Design an enzyme around this catalytic site. Structure first.
Site, short mmCIF file in Angstrom:
data_model
loop_
_atom_site.label_atom_id
_atom_site.label_comp_id
_atom_site.label_asym_id
_atom_site.label_seq_id
_atom_site.Cartn_x
_atom_site.Cartn_y
_atom_site.Cartn_z
CG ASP A 130 -2.08 0.90 1.11
OD1 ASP A 130 -1.89 2.13 1.04
OD2 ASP A 130 -3.22 0.38 1.09
CG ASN B 289 -12.05 -0.67 4.42
OD1 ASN B 289 -12.26 -1.16 5.53
ND2 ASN B 289 -11.00 0.09 4.15
N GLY C 70 -15.43 3.02 4.54
CA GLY C 70 -14.30 3.83 4.12
C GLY C 70 -13.63 3.34 2.85
CD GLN C 71 -15.08 -0.60 -1.68
OE1 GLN C 71 -16.21 -0.82 -1.22
NE2 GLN C 71 -14.54 -1.34 -2.65
CG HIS D 172 -8.90 -3.37 -1.76
ND1 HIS D 172 -9.93 -2.64 -2.33
CD2 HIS D 172 -8.49 -2.66 -0.68
CE1 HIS D 172 -10.14 -1.54 -1.61
NE2 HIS D 172 -9.28 -1.54 -0.61
CG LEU D 173 -7.50 -9.50 2.61
CD1 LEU D 173 -8.79 -9.57 3.43
CD2 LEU D 173 -6.90 -10.89 2.42
CG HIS D 174 -6.75 -2.87 3.49
ND1 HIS D 174 -6.02 -1.72 3.24
CD2 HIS D 174 -7.98 -2.66 2.96
CE1 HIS D 174 -6.77 -0.87 2.57
NE2 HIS D 174 -7.97 -1.41 2.39
C1 LIG Z 1 -8.28 5.35 2.35
C2 LIG Z 1 -9.56 4.59 2.71
N1 LIG Z 1 -9.81 4.61 4.14
C3 LIG Z 1 -9.44 3.16 2.29
O1 LIG Z 1 -8.99 2.31 3.06
N2 LIG Z 1 -9.85 2.89 1.06
S1 LIG Z 1 -9.82 1.39 0.49
O2 LIG Z 1 -10.40 0.44 1.38
O3 LIG Z 1 -10.44 1.35 -0.82
O4 LIG Z 1 -8.33 1.04 0.34
C4 LIG Z 1 -7.66 1.34 -0.87
C5 LIG Z 1 -6.18 1.31 -0.55
O5 LIG Z 1 -5.49 1.43 -1.79
C6 LIG Z 1 -4.33 2.21 -1.54
N3 LIG Z 1 -3.85 2.76 -2.82
C7 LIG Z 1 -4.42 3.71 -3.57
N4 LIG Z 1 -3.69 3.94 -4.68
C8 LIG Z 1 -2.63 3.10 -4.64
C9 LIG Z 1 -1.47 2.82 -5.51
N5 LIG Z 1 -1.32 3.52 -6.67
N6 LIG Z 1 -0.60 1.87 -5.10
C10 LIG Z 1 -0.77 1.19 -3.94
N7 LIG Z 1 -1.81 1.39 -3.10
C11 LIG Z 1 -2.74 2.32 -3.41
C12 LIG Z 1 -4.77 3.26 -0.55
O6 LIG Z 1 -3.63 3.81 0.13
C13 LIG Z 1 -5.73 2.48 0.34
O7 LIG Z 1 -5.13 1.97 1.54
#
Ligand SMILES: C[C@H](N)C(=O)NS(=O)(=O)OC[C@H]1O[C@@H](n2cnc3c(N)ncnc32)[C@H](O)[C@@H]1O
Lengths: 114, 115
Positions: free
Chosen positions: B32, B88, B94-95, B101-103
Site C-alpha cells: 500500500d 472495506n 471507508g472504501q 481488495h483485502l488489506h
Molecule cells: C483510504 C480509505 N480509508 C481506504 O482504506 N480505502 S480502500 O479500502 O479502498 O483502500 C484502498 C487502498 O489502496 C491504496 N492505494 C491507492 N492507490 C494506490 C497505488 N497507486 N498503489 C498502492 N496502493 C494504493 C490506498 O492507500 C488504500 O489503503
C-alpha cells in the site's frame, strides 16, 4: 468437534448466542462485545485455530464465510457499508483461537483500522 | 478490460508501478502507498469485482484465495507476531477504490475497535 474454545461451545449450542444464520459449514451470530451498532461474526464449524494455519483446501470455505457475511450484512440493513476483519495472533488482537470473520457497520468506520 | 477501470486495473496491467509481493493467474499482492502499519499490503483479484457486497456465490473460491495468499505473503514477510486482514465496503467502510481488495496490516500492535 468444533474445538475447545468458547466458539466451539456456541457451535455445539452449549451456550447461547444470538444466531443470525447457520448452514452445514458455518455459523453467524452477534458479537457479545459489539464495537458498532451492528457487529457480528461468521465462523466455520471446522476448527481452524487461526488464519495462518488455514490449508489450501480451505479456500472455498473461507470465501464462504465472506459471502455469508455480506448476505447477512444486507439482511441486517447495512446499506451504507461495513467493514470485515480477520485478526491473527497477538499483534492482530485475535481474541479466540478459532477463525472468525468480524462484520461491523451502522456507523462510520475509521482509518486506520486499529 | 482485464482488471477493470480502477487504478488497481492499471496496476494489474503494469500500466502504473507497484511494489509487487506475489502474482498468480487469479490475484496480485502489492504494498500500500499509504501504509497504516509498518507492513501494509493489499491482495486483489485480477477479475474486477467492485465491492464485496456485489460478489457472486461463484466468487467464493476466489475470495478465499485472497485470504490464503494474504496469509502466505504475511508469513513470507516475517509477520510472525500476527496481523489484521480488512475488507472495506462502501461509505461506512471507508472504501475509496471500488475494486475488491483485502488489506493485510502488521508489524505493530493493532488496537480494538478496528476503526
Ligand atoms: C483510504 C480509505 N480509508 C481506504 O482504506 N480505502 S480502500 O479500502 O479502498 O483502500 C484502498 C487502498 O489502496 C491504496 N492505494 C491507492 N492507490 C494506490 C497505488 N497507486 N498503489 C498502492 N496502493 C494504493 C490506498 O492507500 C488504500 O489503503
Amino acid at each position: 468437534p468444533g474445538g475447545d474454545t468458547i466458539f466451539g461451545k456456541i457451535i455445539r449450542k452449549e451456550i447461547p448466542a444470538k444466531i443470525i444464520f447457520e448452514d452445514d459449514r458455518c455459523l453467524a451470530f452477534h458479537d457479545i462485545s459489539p464495537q458498532a451498532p451492528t457487529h457480528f461474526l461468521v465462523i466455520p464449524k471446522k476448527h481452524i485455530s487461526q488464519i495462518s494455519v488455514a490449508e489450501d483446501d480451505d479456500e472455498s470455505l473461507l470465501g464462504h464465510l465472506m459471502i455469508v457475511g455480506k448476505k447477512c450484512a444486507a439482511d441486517l440493513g447495512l446499506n451504507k457499508g461495513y467493514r470485515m476483519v480477520v485478526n491473527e495472533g497477538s499483534d492482530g488482537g485475535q481474541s479466540v483461537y478459532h477463525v472468525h470473520l468480524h462484520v461491523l457497520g451502522g456507523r462510520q468506520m475509521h482509518w486506520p483500522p486499529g
